[PDB]
Design a binder for this molecule. Structure first.
Ligand SMILES: [Mg+2]
Length: 317
C-alpha cells in the first residue's frame, strides 16, 4: 500500500526528461518535427523522452508494463538520428536499443501494474514555446498510485508530484530533493474564479465555455494554455477551475493526458470528474471510454460548475 520507490524513480526520470526537452528546444524546431497521419505533431523531444523513460522503467521494474503515446512505426531517419544524440547524453544505448525502448510503450492498460507516459503532453505548446509537460503516472488495475508533471516553461521550471494518500509537492526542475507542500485554492465564489482551458480552438469548446463562465458570473478572462500544466495550475492554487469541453460524445480522452494531473489535483485537495460529474475511470484501457471531457477544480466550486456545464452541453451526440 506504499509506492515510495515508484514515486522516487518517477521524479528522477521526469527531471532528466525536462533536461532533454529543454535541450531540444535550444535549436530550430521545424527540422525536429514530424506530422503524424492524424496531422498531430511529434518532435525529437517526444521520442527522446520516451526512449529514456521507458528504458529507465524497464531497468528498475522489468516486470511492469508501459502505456506510452509514441511508437517508431512512421519515424523519419533524420528525426531518429537526432533522437539518438539526445538520448545518449543520458543513456548508453545503441540506435536499435533506442528503437526498442520507444516501442515498449504498447501496453493496453487495465489489470496489473502499468506506467502511463506522455513524453510531451502539449506538443503544440512545445512548438509554441509556451506550456508543455512531461507526464508520468503509475497505476495498478486502473487506480492511480503516483503522478508526476514536469513543466519546464512554467514559472521558471516546475515539477509537481504526488502519490495516493500522501499529498502533493512542488519542486523546481533543478532540485527534486527539496519540495514544498501545495494545496488547491480556497476561492468559494464562482465570480472570483480564475478559469483555464486549452489554447487550441479544436481541443475544447471555447464558445460553450464562455457561456458557462458567463452564467457562473466569472469576471476574469480565461487563462489559455497547452497541456497537463493546467492540472498543475489547479493543484498549486494558480487557477480555480479547468474545463475541457468536447463537441461530441465520440471522442475519448487518452489516459496519458489525465492520469498524473488527476491524482495530483486530488492529493492537493481538489476534485476531478468529467462534464457530467462522474469520476474518471482509468481501468478501461488506453482511453477514458466511460467519460466525456474534464472538469477539474479546487473542490469547493466543483458541483456549482458541473451543473452549468451539463446544462449547456445537454445537446451532445
Ligand atoms: Mg504527447
Amino acid at each position: 500500500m506504499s509506492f515510495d520507490k515508484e514515486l522516487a524513480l518517477a521524479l528522477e526520470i521526469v527531471q532528466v526528461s525536462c533536461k532533454i526537452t529543454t535541450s531540444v528546444a535550444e535549436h530550430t524546431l521545424t527540422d525536429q518535427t514530424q506530422i503524424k497521419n492524424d496531422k498531430s505533431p511529434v518532435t525529437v523531444g517526444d521520442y527522446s523522452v520516451q526512449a529514456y523513460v521507458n528504458k529507465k522503467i524497464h531497468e528498475t521494474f522489468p516486470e511492469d508494463q508501459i502505456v506510452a503515446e509514441e511508437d517508431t512505426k512512421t519515424i523519419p531517419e533524420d528525426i531518429f538520428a537526432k533522437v539518438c544524440k539526445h538520448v545518449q547524453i543520458y543513456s548508453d544505448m545503441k540506435d536499435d536499443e533506442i528503437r526498442k525502448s520507444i516501442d515498449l510503450g504498447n501496453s493496453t492498460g487495465g489489470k496489473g501494474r502499468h506506467w502511463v507516459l506522455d513524453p510531451i503532453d502539449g506538443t503544440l505548446g512545445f512548438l509554441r514555446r509556451e506550456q508543455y509537460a512531461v507526464c508520468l503516472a503509475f497505476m495498478i488495475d486502473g487506480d492511480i498510485k503516483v503522478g508526476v508533471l514536469g513543466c519546464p516553461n512554467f514559472e521558471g521550471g516546475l515539477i509537481v508530484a504526488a502519490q495516493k494518500g500522501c499529498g502533493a509537492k512542488m519542486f523546481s526542475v533543478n532540485d527534486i530533493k527539496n519540495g514544498k507542500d501545495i494545496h488547491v485554492s480556497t476561492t468559494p465564489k464562482t465570480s472570483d474564479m480564475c478559469f483555464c482551458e486549452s489554447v487550441e480552438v479544436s481541443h475544447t469548446d471555447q464558445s460553450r465555455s464562455k457561456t458557462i463562465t458567463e452564467r457562473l458570473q466569472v469576471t476574469k478572462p480565461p487563462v489559455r494554455m497547452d497541456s497537463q500544466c493546467k492540472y498543475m495550475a489547479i493543484a498549486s492554487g494558480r487557477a480555480d477551475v479547468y474545463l475541457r469541453l468536447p463537441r461530441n460524445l465520440s471522442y475519448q480522452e487518452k489516459i496519458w493526458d489525465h492520469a498524473a494531473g488527476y491524482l495530483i489535483v486530488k492529493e492537493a485537495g481538489g476534485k476531478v470528474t468529467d462534464i457530467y460529474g462522474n469520476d474518471l475511470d482509468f481501468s478501461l484501457g488506453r482511453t477514458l471510454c466511460n467519460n466525456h471531457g474534464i472538469v477539474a477544480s479546487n473542490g469547493i466550486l466543483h458541483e456549482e460548475t458541473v451543473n452549468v456545464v451539463k446544462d449547456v452541453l445537454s445537446d451532445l451526440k
